[PDB]
Coordinates of C-alpha atoms and ligand atoms in Angstrom, one line a residue:
Chain A
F1 CA -51.9 296.4 62.5
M2 CA -53.9 298.0 65.4
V3 CA -57.6 298.7 64.9
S4 CA -59.2 301.8 66.3
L5 CA -60.2 302.0 69.9
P6 CA -63.9 302.3 70.4
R7 CA -65.5 305.4 72.0
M8 CA -64.7 305.6 75.7
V9 CA -65.8 308.0 78.5
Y10 CA -63.2 308.6 81.1
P11 CA -61.6 311.6 83.0
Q12 CA -59.6 314.0 80.9
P13 CA -55.9 313.9 81.7
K14 CA -54.8 317.4 82.6
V15 CA -51.4 318.4 81.8
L16 CA -51.0 320.9 84.6
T17 CA -52.1 318.4 87.2
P18 CA -49.6 315.4 87.6
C19 CA -51.0 312.0 88.6
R20 CA -48.4 311.4 91.4
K21 CA -46.1 314.2 92.7
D22 CA -44.5 312.1 95.3
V23 CA -42.5 309.6 93.1
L24 CA -40.6 309.5 89.8
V25 CA -43.0 308.2 87.1
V26 CA -40.7 308.2 84.1
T27 CA -37.0 307.1 83.9
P28 CA -34.4 309.5 82.3
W29 CA -34.5 307.2 79.2
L30 CA -38.3 307.9 78.9
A31 CA -39.6 304.5 80.2
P32 CA -42.7 304.7 82.4
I33 CA -42.2 303.7 86.1
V34 CA -45.5 301.9 86.8
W35 CA -47.3 303.2 90.0
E36 CA -51.0 303.3 90.9
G37 CA -52.5 306.5 89.6
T38 CA -50.3 306.6 86.5
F39 CA -52.5 304.4 84.2
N40 CA -56.1 304.1 83.1
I41 CA -56.5 300.3 83.0
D42 CA -59.6 300.5 80.8
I43 CA -57.6 302.1 78.1
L44 CA -54.8 299.6 78.4
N45 CA -57.1 296.7 78.5
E46 CA -58.8 297.8 75.3
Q47 CA -55.4 298.2 73.6
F48 CA -54.1 294.8 74.6
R49 CA -57.4 292.9 74.0
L50 CA -57.6 294.4 70.5
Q51 CA -54.2 292.7 69.8
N52 CA -55.5 289.3 71.4
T53 CA -52.5 289.4 73.7
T54 CA -51.3 286.2 75.3
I55 CA -49.1 286.3 78.4
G56 CA -46.9 283.5 79.5
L57 CA -46.0 283.3 83.2
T58 CA -43.0 281.2 84.2
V59 CA -42.4 279.9 87.7
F60 CA -40.0 277.4 89.1
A61 CA -41.0 275.1 92.0
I62 CA -38.1 272.7 92.8
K63 CA -37.8 270.6 95.9
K64 CA -39.7 272.0 98.8
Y65 CA -40.9 275.1 96.8
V66 CA -43.7 273.0 95.3
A67 CA -45.6 273.8 98.5
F68 CA -46.0 277.4 97.3
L69 CA -47.8 276.7 94.0
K70 CA -51.3 276.4 95.3
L71 CA -51.5 279.9 96.7
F72 CA -49.4 281.3 93.9
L73 CA -51.7 280.0 91.2
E74 CA -54.9 280.5 93.0
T75 CA -54.1 284.2 93.7
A76 CA -52.8 284.5 90.1
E77 CA -56.2 283.5 89.0
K78 CA -57.8 286.3 91.0
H79 CA -55.3 289.1 90.1
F80 CA -53.0 288.3 87.1
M81 CA -54.0 289.4 83.7
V82 CA -57.7 288.7 84.3
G83 CA -59.6 288.9 81.0
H84 CA -56.6 288.2 78.9
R85 CA -55.2 284.9 77.6
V86 CA -52.7 283.4 80.1
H87 CA -50.4 280.4 79.8
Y88 CA -48.7 279.3 83.0
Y89 CA -45.4 277.4 82.7
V90 CA -44.6 275.5 85.8
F91 CA -41.1 274.2 85.9
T92 CA -40.6 271.5 88.5
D93 CA -38.8 268.3 89.6
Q94 CA -42.0 266.9 91.0
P95 CA -44.8 267.0 88.3
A96 CA -47.1 265.0 90.6
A97 CA -46.9 267.6 93.4
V98 CA -48.3 270.4 91.2
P99 CA -51.8 271.2 92.8
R100 CA -54.9 270.9 90.8
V101 CA -56.0 274.6 90.5
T102 CA -59.2 275.6 88.7
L103 CA -58.5 278.1 85.9
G104 CA -60.7 280.8 84.4
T105 CA -61.6 280.6 80.7
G106 CA -58.8 281.4 78.3
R107 CA -56.1 280.3 80.7
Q108 CA -53.9 277.2 80.6
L109 CA -51.2 275.6 82.6
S110 CA -48.3 273.4 81.3
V111 CA -46.1 271.4 83.7
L112 CA -42.5 271.2 82.5
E113 CA -40.2 268.7 84.2
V114 CA -36.7 269.6 85.0
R115 CA -33.8 267.7 86.5
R116 CA -30.4 277.3 86.2
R117 CA -33.6 279.5 85.6
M118 CA -31.9 281.7 82.9
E119 CA -30.8 278.6 81.0
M120 CA -34.1 276.9 81.3
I121 CA -36.0 280.0 80.2
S122 CA -33.7 280.6 77.1
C123 CA -38.0 276.6 75.8
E124 CA -37.2 279.3 73.2
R125 CA -39.1 277.8 70.3
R126 CA -42.1 276.9 72.4
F127 CA -42.6 280.4 73.9
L128 CA -42.3 282.1 70.5
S129 CA -45.1 280.0 69.1
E130 CA -47.4 280.2 72.2
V131 CA -47.2 283.6 73.9
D132 CA -46.6 287.3 73.0
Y133 CA -45.0 288.3 76.4
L134 CA -43.2 286.4 79.1
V135 CA -43.4 287.3 82.8
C136 CA -40.8 285.5 85.0
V137 CA -41.4 285.3 88.7
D138 CA -40.5 283.7 92.0
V139 CA -43.0 281.1 93.4
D140 CA -42.8 281.9 97.0
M141 CA -45.2 284.8 96.5
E142 CA -48.9 285.7 96.3
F143 CA -51.0 288.1 94.3
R144 CA -52.9 290.5 96.5
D145 CA -54.1 293.0 94.0
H146 CA -54.2 293.8 90.3
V147 CA -51.2 292.9 88.1
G148 CA -52.2 293.5 84.5
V149 CA -51.3 294.6 81.1
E150 CA -49.9 297.9 82.4
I151 CA -46.7 295.9 82.9
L152 CA -46.4 294.8 79.3
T153 CA -43.7 296.3 77.1
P154 CA -40.7 294.9 75.2
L155 CA -38.5 294.7 78.4
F156 CA -39.2 295.4 82.0
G157 CA -37.6 295.1 85.4
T158 CA -39.0 295.7 88.9
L159 CA -37.6 297.9 91.6
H160 CA -36.3 295.8 94.5
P161 CA -38.3 296.8 97.6
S162 CA -35.2 297.0 99.9
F163 CA -33.4 299.6 97.6
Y164 CA -35.9 301.9 95.8
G165 CA -35.0 304.8 98.2
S166 CA -31.2 303.9 98.3
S167 CA -28.2 305.6 96.7
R168 CA -26.5 303.6 94.0
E169 CA -23.4 303.0 96.2
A170 CA -25.6 301.1 98.6
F171 CA -26.9 298.8 95.9
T172 CA -25.7 295.3 96.3
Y173 CA -24.4 295.0 92.7
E174 CA -21.5 292.6 92.1
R175 CA -18.5 294.8 92.9
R176 CA -15.6 292.5 91.8
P177 CA -14.1 293.5 88.4
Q178 CA -13.4 289.8 87.8
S179 CA -17.1 289.0 87.4
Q180 CA -19.1 289.6 84.2
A181 CA -21.8 291.1 86.5
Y182 CA -19.5 293.9 87.8
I183 CA -20.9 297.4 88.1
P184 CA -18.6 300.2 89.5
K185 CA -19.8 302.4 92.4
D186 CA -20.5 305.4 90.1
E187 CA -22.8 303.4 87.7
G188 CA -26.3 302.2 88.1
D189 CA -29.8 303.4 87.6
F190 CA -31.8 301.1 89.9
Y191 CA -31.5 297.9 91.8
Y192 CA -33.9 295.4 90.1
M193 CA -35.3 292.4 91.7
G194 CA -34.5 289.1 90.1
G195 CA -37.9 287.7 91.1
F196 CA -40.0 289.7 88.6
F197 CA -38.9 290.6 85.1
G198 CA -40.3 290.1 81.6
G199 CA -41.0 291.4 78.2
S200 CA -41.7 290.3 74.7
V201 CA -40.6 286.8 74.1
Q202 CA -37.7 288.0 71.9
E203 CA -36.4 290.4 74.5
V204 CA -36.7 288.0 77.4
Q205 CA -34.8 285.3 75.4
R206 CA -32.1 288.0 74.7
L207 CA -31.8 288.8 78.4
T208 CA -31.8 285.2 79.6
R209 CA -29.3 284.1 76.9
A210 CA -27.0 287.0 77.8
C211 CA -27.2 286.3 81.6
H212 CA -26.7 282.5 81.1
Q213 CA -23.6 283.2 78.9
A214 CA -22.3 285.7 81.5
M215 CA -22.9 283.1 84.3
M216 CA -21.0 280.5 82.3
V217 CA -18.0 282.9 81.9
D218 CA -18.0 283.5 85.6
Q219 CA -18.1 279.7 86.4
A220 CA -15.2 279.1 84.1
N221 CA -13.3 281.9 85.9
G222 CA -14.2 280.4 89.3
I223 CA -16.3 283.4 90.5
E224 CA -20.0 283.4 91.6
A225 CA -21.8 286.7 91.6
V226 CA -22.9 288.0 95.0
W227 CA -26.6 287.7 94.2
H228 CA -26.3 285.1 91.4
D229 CA -28.7 285.6 88.5
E230 CA -30.0 288.8 90.1
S231 CA -26.5 290.3 89.8
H232 CA -26.4 289.4 86.1
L233 CA -29.9 290.7 85.5
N234 CA -28.8 294.0 87.0
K235 CA -25.8 294.2 84.7
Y236 CA -28.0 293.5 81.7
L237 CA -30.6 296.1 82.6
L238 CA -27.9 298.7 83.2
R239 CA -26.6 298.1 79.6
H240 CA -30.0 297.4 78.0
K241 CA -32.4 299.9 79.5
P242 CA -35.9 298.5 80.2
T243 CA -38.8 300.0 78.4
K244 CA -40.9 300.0 81.6
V245 CA -39.9 299.8 85.3
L246 CA -42.3 298.4 87.8
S247 CA -42.6 300.1 91.2
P248 CA -42.3 298.1 94.4
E249 CA -46.0 297.7 94.4
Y250 CA -45.2 294.8 92.2
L251 CA -42.7 293.0 94.5
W252 CA -43.1 293.7 98.3
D253 CA -42.6 292.1 101.6
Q254 CA -45.1 293.4 104.1
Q255 CA -43.6 291.5 107.1
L256 CA -40.1 293.1 106.5
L257 CA -41.1 296.5 105.2
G258 CA -44.7 297.3 106.3
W259 CA -47.1 299.4 104.2
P260 CA -45.6 302.7 103.5
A261 CA -47.8 305.6 102.3
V262 CA -46.0 305.8 98.9
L263 CA -47.4 302.3 98.1
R264 CA -51.1 302.7 97.3
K265 CA -51.4 299.0 96.5
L266 CA -49.5 295.9 97.5
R267 CA -49.9 293.7 94.4
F268 CA -47.4 290.8 94.6
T269 CA -45.9 289.9 97.9
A270 CA -43.7 287.6 99.8
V271 CA -45.3 284.7 101.7
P272 CA -44.3 284.6 105.4
Chain B
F1 CA -30.6 293.7 67.7
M2 CA -29.4 296.4 70.2
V3 CA -25.8 296.2 71.4
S4 CA -24.9 297.1 75.0
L5 CA -24.5 300.7 76.0
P6 CA -21.0 301.6 77.1
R7 CA -20.2 302.6 80.6
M8 CA -21.6 306.1 81.4
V9 CA -21.3 308.4 84.4
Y10 CA -24.4 310.4 85.2
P11 CA -26.7 311.4 88.1
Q12 CA -28.7 308.6 89.7
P13 CA -32.4 308.8 89.1
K14 CA -34.1 308.8 92.5
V15 CA -37.4 307.3 92.7
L16 CA -38.6 309.5 95.6
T17 CA -37.7 312.7 93.9
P18 CA -39.8 313.4 90.7
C19 CA -38.1 315.3 87.8
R20 CA -41.0 317.7 87.3
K21 CA -43.9 318.0 89.9
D22 CA -45.6 320.8 88.1
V23 CA -46.8 318.9 85.0
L24 CA -48.1 315.5 83.9
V25 CA -45.1 313.6 82.5
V26 CA -46.9 310.3 81.4
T27 CA -50.2 309.8 79.8
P28 CA -52.9 307.4 81.3
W29 CA -51.9 304.9 78.5
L30 CA -48.3 305.1 79.8
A31 CA -46.8 307.3 77.0
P32 CA -44.1 309.8 78.1
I33 CA -45.0 313.5 77.8
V34 CA -41.7 315.0 76.8
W35 CA -40.7 318.1 78.9
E36 CA -37.3 319.4 79.8
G37 CA -36.0 317.7 83.0
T38 CA -37.6 314.3 82.1
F39 CA -34.8 312.9 79.9
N40 CA -31.0 312.4 79.9
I41 CA -30.1 313.2 76.4
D42 CA -26.8 311.5 76.6
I43 CA -28.5 308.2 77.3
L44 CA -30.9 308.7 74.5
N45 CA -28.3 309.8 72.1
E46 CA -26.3 306.7 72.8
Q47 CA -29.3 304.4 72.3
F48 CA -30.3 306.0 69.0
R49 CA -26.7 306.2 67.5
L50 CA -26.1 302.6 68.3
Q51 CA -29.1 301.9 66.0
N52 CA -27.6 304.3 63.3
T53 CA -31.0 306.1 63.3
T54 CA -31.9 308.2 60.3
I55 CA -34.7 310.9 60.7
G56 CA -36.6 312.3 57.8
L57 CA -38.1 315.8 58.2
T58 CA -40.9 316.8 55.9
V59 CA -41.9 320.4 55.2
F60 CA -44.2 321.9 52.6
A61 CA -43.4 325.3 51.1
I62 CA -46.0 326.3 48.5
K63 CA -46.5 329.7 47.0
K64 CA -45.4 332.5 49.4
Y65 CA -44.2 330.0 52.1
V66 CA -41.0 329.4 50.3
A67 CA -39.8 332.6 52.0
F68 CA -39.7 330.6 55.3
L69 CA -37.3 327.9 54.2
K70 CA -34.0 329.7 54.8
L71 CA -34.5 330.3 58.5
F72 CA -36.4 327.0 59.0
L73 CA -33.4 325.0 57.5
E74 CA -30.7 327.0 59.0
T75 CA -32.1 326.8 62.5
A76 CA -32.8 323.1 61.9
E77 CA -29.1 322.7 61.3
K78 CA -28.3 324.2 64.6
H79 CA -30.9 322.4 66.7
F80 CA -32.6 319.4 65.0
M81 CA -31.2 315.9 65.6
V82 CA -27.6 317.2 65.6
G83 CA -25.2 314.2 65.5
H84 CA -27.7 312.0 63.9
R85 CA -28.4 311.2 60.2
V86 CA -31.1 313.6 58.8
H87 CA -32.9 313.7 55.5
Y88 CA -34.9 316.8 54.8
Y89 CA -37.8 316.5 52.3
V90 CA -38.9 319.8 51.0
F91 CA -42.1 319.7 49.1
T92 CA -42.6 322.8 46.9
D93 CA -44.2 324.3 43.8
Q94 CA -41.0 326.3 43.2
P95 CA -37.9 324.1 43.3
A96 CA -35.8 327.1 42.1
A97 CA -36.8 329.2 45.2
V98 CA -35.4 326.6 47.7
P99 CA -32.4 328.5 49.4
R100 CA -29.0 327.0 49.3
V101 CA -28.3 326.0 52.9
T102 CA -25.1 324.6 54.1
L103 CA -25.6 321.2 55.9
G104 CA -23.6 319.4 58.5
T105 CA -22.1 316.1 57.8
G106 CA -24.5 313.1 57.5
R107 CA -27.4 315.4 56.5
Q108 CA -29.1 315.7 53.1
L109 CA -31.9 317.6 51.5
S110 CA -34.2 316.4 48.7
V111 CA -36.5 318.9 46.8
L112 CA -39.8 317.3 45.7
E113 CA -41.9 319.2 43.3
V114 CA -45.6 319.2 43.8
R115 CA -48.4 320.7 41.7
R116 CA -53.0 317.8 50.3
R117 CA -50.1 317.1 52.9
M118 CA -51.5 313.9 54.2
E119 CA -52.0 312.6 50.7
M120 CA -48.5 313.7 49.6
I121 CA -46.9 312.2 52.7
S122 CA -48.7 308.8 52.3
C123 CA -43.7 309.0 48.9
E124 CA -44.4 305.7 50.8
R125 CA -41.8 303.5 49.2
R126 CA -39.1 306.2 49.2
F127 CA -39.4 306.9 52.9
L128 CA -39.4 303.2 53.9
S129 CA -36.1 302.8 52.0
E130 CA -34.4 306.0 53.3
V131 CA -35.4 306.8 56.9
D132 CA -36.3 305.1 60.2
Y133 CA -38.6 307.9 61.5
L134 CA -40.6 310.7 59.9
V135 CA -41.1 314.1 61.5
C136 CA -43.8 316.3 59.8
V137 CA -43.8 320.0 60.5
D138 CA -45.0 323.4 59.4
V139 CA -42.5 325.6 57.6
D140 CA -43.4 329.0 59.1
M141 CA -41.3 328.2 62.1
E142 CA -37.8 328.3 63.6
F143 CA -35.8 326.1 65.9
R144 CA -34.6 328.0 68.9
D145 CA -33.4 325.1 71.1
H146 CA -32.7 321.3 71.1
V147 CA -35.2 319.1 69.3
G148 CA -33.6 315.6 69.3
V149 CA -34.1 311.9 69.6
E150 CA -36.1 312.2 72.8
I151 CA -39.1 312.7 70.5
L152 CA -38.6 309.5 68.6
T153 CA -41.1 306.7 69.1
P154 CA -43.5 304.7 66.9
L155 CA -46.2 307.5 67.0
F156 CA -46.2 311.0 68.5
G157 CA -48.3 314.1 68.6
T158 CA -47.6 317.5 70.1
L159 CA -49.7 319.5 72.5
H160 CA -51.2 322.6 70.8
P161 CA -49.9 325.6 72.7
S162 CA -53.3 327.3 72.9
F163 CA -55.0 324.3 74.6
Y164 CA -52.7 322.4 76.9
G165 CA -54.4 324.0 80.0
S166 CA -57.9 323.7 78.6
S167 CA -60.8 321.4 79.4
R168 CA -61.8 319.0 76.6
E169 CA -65.1 320.8 76.0
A170 CA -63.1 323.9 75.0
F171 CA -61.0 322.0 72.5
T172 CA -61.8 322.9 68.9
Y173 CA -62.4 319.4 67.7
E174 CA -64.8 318.9 64.8
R175 CA -68.2 318.7 66.5
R176 CA -70.5 317.8 63.6
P177 CA -71.5 314.1 63.6
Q178 CA -71.6 314.2 59.8
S179 CA -67.8 314.5 59.6
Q180 CA -65.4 311.6 59.9
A181 CA -63.4 313.9 62.3
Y182 CA -66.2 314.2 64.8
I183 CA -65.4 313.9 68.5
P184 CA -68.2 314.3 71.1
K185 CA -67.8 316.7 74.0
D186 CA -67.2 314.0 76.6
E187 CA -64.3 312.5 74.5
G188 CA -60.7 313.6 74.0
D189 CA -57.4 313.3 75.8
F190 CA -55.5 316.3 74.3
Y191 CA -55.7 318.8 71.5
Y192 CA -52.8 318.0 69.2
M193 CA -51.2 320.5 66.8
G194 CA -51.3 319.6 63.2
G195 CA -48.0 321.2 62.6
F196 CA -45.7 318.7 64.4
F197 CA -46.4 315.0 64.4
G198 CA -44.3 311.9 63.5
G199 CA -43.3 308.4 64.2
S200 CA -41.8 305.4 62.6
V201 CA -42.3 305.4 58.8
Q202 CA -44.9 302.7 59.1
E203 CA -46.9 304.5 61.7
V204 CA -46.8 307.8 60.0
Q205 CA -48.0 306.2 56.7
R206 CA -50.8 304.6 58.6
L207 CA -51.9 307.9 60.1
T208 CA -51.6 309.9 56.9
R209 CA -53.4 307.2 54.9
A210 CA -56.2 307.1 57.4
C211 CA -56.5 310.9 57.6
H212 CA -56.5 311.2 53.8
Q213 CA -59.2 308.6 53.5
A214 CA -61.3 310.3 56.1
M215 CA -60.8 313.7 54.3
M216 CA -62.0 312.1 51.0
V217 CA -65.1 310.8 52.7
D218 CA -65.9 314.2 54.1
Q219 CA -65.3 315.8 50.6
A220 CA -67.8 313.3 49.0
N221 CA -70.3 314.2 51.8
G222 CA -69.8 317.9 51.2
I223 CA -68.3 318.7 54.7
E224 CA -64.9 320.2 55.5
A225 CA -63.6 319.8 59.0
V226 CA -63.3 322.9 61.2
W227 CA -59.5 322.7 61.3
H228 CA -58.9 320.6 58.2
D229 CA -56.2 318.0 58.5
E230 CA -55.6 319.0 62.2
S231 CA -59.2 317.9 63.0
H232 CA -58.6 314.5 61.4
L233 CA -55.2 314.1 63.1
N234 CA -57.0 314.7 66.4
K235 CA -59.6 312.0 65.6
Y236 CA -56.8 309.6 64.6
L237 CA -54.8 310.2 67.8
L238 CA -57.9 309.8 70.0
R239 CA -58.4 306.3 68.5
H240 CA -54.8 305.4 68.1
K241 CA -53.0 306.6 71.1
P242 CA -49.6 308.1 70.6
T243 CA -46.6 306.4 72.2
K244 CA -45.1 309.8 73.2
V245 CA -46.6 313.2 73.5
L246 CA -44.5 316.3 73.0
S247 CA -45.1 319.2 75.4
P248 CA -45.7 322.7 74.1
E249 CA -41.9 323.3 74.3
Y250 CA -42.0 321.8 70.9
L251 CA -44.6 324.1 69.2
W252 CA -44.9 327.6 70.7
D253 CA -45.7 331.1 69.7
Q254 CA -43.9 333.6 71.9
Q255 CA -45.7 336.6 70.5
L256 CA -49.2 335.2 71.2
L257 CA -48.4 333.4 74.5
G258 CA -45.2 334.7 76.0
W259 CA -42.8 332.6 78.0
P260 CA -44.6 330.9 80.9
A261 CA -42.6 329.4 83.8
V262 CA -43.8 325.9 83.0
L263 CA -41.9 326.1 79.7
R264 CA -38.2 325.8 80.6
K265 CA -37.2 325.8 76.9
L266 CA -38.9 327.2 73.8
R267 CA -37.6 324.8 71.1
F268 CA -39.7 325.3 67.9
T269 CA -41.6 328.5 67.5
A270 CA -43.7 330.5 65.2
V271 CA -42.1 333.1 63.1
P272 CA -43.8 336.7 63.6
Ligands
UDP1 O1 -35.0 275.1 96.4 C1 -35.4 276.0 95.7 C2 -34.8 277.2 95.6 C3 -35.3 278.2 94.7 N1 -36.4 277.9 93.8 C4 -37.0 278.8 92.8 O2 -36.0 279.9 92.8 C5 -36.7 281.1 93.3 C6 -35.6 282.1 93.9 O3 -35.2 281.6 95.2 P1 -35.8 282.2 96.5 O4 -37.2 282.6 96.2 O5 -35.6 281.3 97.6 O6 -34.9 283.4 96.7 P2 -35.2 284.5 97.8 O7 -36.4 285.3 97.5 O8 -35.3 283.7 99.2 O9 -33.9 285.4 98.1 C7 -37.7 280.5 94.2 O10 -38.8 281.4 94.3 C8 -38.3 279.4 93.4 O11 -39.1 280.2 92.6 C9 -37.0 276.7 93.9 O12 -37.9 276.4 93.2 N2 -36.5 275.7 94.8
UDP2 O1 -49.9 328.8 51.0 C1 -49.6 327.9 51.8 C2 -50.3 327.5 52.9 C3 -49.8 326.5 53.7 N1 -48.6 325.9 53.5 C4 -47.9 324.8 54.2 O2 -49.0 324.4 55.1 C5 -48.6 324.7 56.5 C6 -49.9 324.9 57.4 O3 -50.4 326.2 57.1 P1 -50.1 327.4 58.0 O4 -48.8 327.3 58.6 O5 -50.4 328.7 57.3 O6 -51.3 327.2 59.1 P2 -51.3 328.1 60.4 O7 -50.1 327.7 61.3 O8 -51.3 329.6 59.9 O9 -52.8 328.0 61.1 C7 -47.7 325.8 56.2 O10 -46.8 325.9 57.3 C8 -46.8 325.4 55.1 O11 -46.0 324.5 55.9 C9 -47.8 326.3 52.4 O12 -46.8 325.8 52.2 N2 -48.3 327.3 51.6
GAL3 O1 -29.4 292.5 98.3 C1 -30.1 291.7 97.5 C2 -31.0 290.6 98.2 O2 -31.9 291.4 99.0 C3 -32.7 290.4 99.8 O3 -33.6 291.3 100.5 C4 -33.3 289.3 99.0 O4 -33.9 288.4 99.9 C5 -32.3 288.6 98.1 O5 -32.9 287.6 97.3 C6 -31.5 289.6 97.3 O6 -32.4 290.3 96.4
GAL4 O1 -58.2 326.0 67.3 C1 -57.2 325.5 66.4 C2 -56.3 326.6 65.7 O2 -55.6 327.2 66.7 C3 -54.9 328.4 66.1 O3 -54.2 328.9 67.2 C4 -54.0 327.9 65.0 O4 -53.4 329.1 64.3 C5 -54.7 327.1 63.9 O5 -53.9 326.6 62.9 C6 -55.5 326.0 64.6 O6 -54.6 325.0 65.2

């Protein structure tokens, strides 16, 4: 049950003025494509706080990648879901190497030791009891700007920053029919980045279970998809359309790609 | 649980080409605004048939308005949810005046005698057992073009065709603070038409229950909102944002308003 929003004063949306004319803001299956200028975050914040939303954030830091956790977490504290309840889940082979990062109120961090990601995510019972949404990201990254509840939806993927202007034939999908991840040249909506996906816990467990099962099939058949879990995530999202798509604001590499005008904000970026 | 879509061949959506540049296609709370050119109906049809979706359509035909049922139903057979399971619910004081209209397969009609609409809709148990979505419309109308599963979502309203280009101060909301339906001059997103709303059964029962309760408050206080249930529906939708908004394609009056270029299709229209 959703209680009423309080009174709010904000600019009237005008039907005959689009927010953004330069980019596609809704997919052909009627999922929003999340760009700056498309959302009023005050409205969204109210909606999600009235539900007392808890967001879980999963990150894997194995071997040398523990070095990235400090900046990842510190910047997440500045920019990720601020004002909301957050549970970080840090999966690592080196629990003692996790940096001690000071968290804002209503935010917690759990260190989970591990001895791959799709298997490990599909923790099932724990997540269902502890968070409403799961966000699953790469660690070798930093938050530079707002990443908030505008992303939350039952199932989301993120446009890969090297391919958002590309034609589908250029996408680096798995092209061998012998792989579970195969996508023919005349199929595909988008090329999604494996380093930023999420959803409700139920939908994320469905995705990760399906990808893990497909990866095990491929292993048994002696085939490894071209881009590993990202190829399988692409297959899944072709066949199970996401209910929002995040623009490349949400997964960028400034060194490789610069700061194009169509990106008003660079929110989550690769570390050099 | 949602099974995988089959393989499909269709045009690639391109991120750097918008469908429509002339109109707002997503609200600031990230709900799609449904216009022609925003959706691939083949994708949507597949999604909703894989769930074996049933749509209920409610219409009231009291007193002289029974004369409108023939054209309403016949045109609904040509254009409303064709291919999907449909249950029409015709609420009337004259069961014997309901015309005998030939229905396509998978479509049924129930005549419900009545001795107002919000009360009557909030049939609760019946609808929960028999349909997935409810669509609630005026009878003095005809389908001229496709109205399909692109409208379906937990909660939708429709832009009133006299006000989609208007500023909020011009909207004919209830402006007396003594009414439950009151909306100040500096609030409002849109002016929704009371003759076309819908949603999941749960959400429609929430809306109609809330509006009926608010109307009873007003009655007890000796006040009748300016536009009756439509004023209350407006209040509700301001405080409970719809998860899709239908463009005025979906509720038009060609005699009063013509055929403007921004309307590519005239789907559901007033009868002269
Ligand atoms: O030795 C490794 C390799 C990978 N990863 C985790 O797997 C993610 C995906 O790998 P990586 O970021 O290297 O892929 P890339 O972005 O270089 O193609 C990493 O961000 C970490 O989050 C890790 O923890 N340790
Ligand atoms: O005598 C009446 C008056 C109203 N209605 C039902 O109430 C709807 C709303 O009234 P109406 O369509 O007259 O409102 P309008 O569009 O003229 O402002 C009608 O479409 C019917 O669907 C009816 O059945 N009989
Ligand atoms: O072609 C797909 C690849 O594109 C690269 O830019 C990225 O570093 C890889 O992880 C993979 O996503
Ligand atoms: O101002 C609101 C009104 O606008 C009219 O055009 C319509 O006939 C009425 O039913 C009501 O919606």
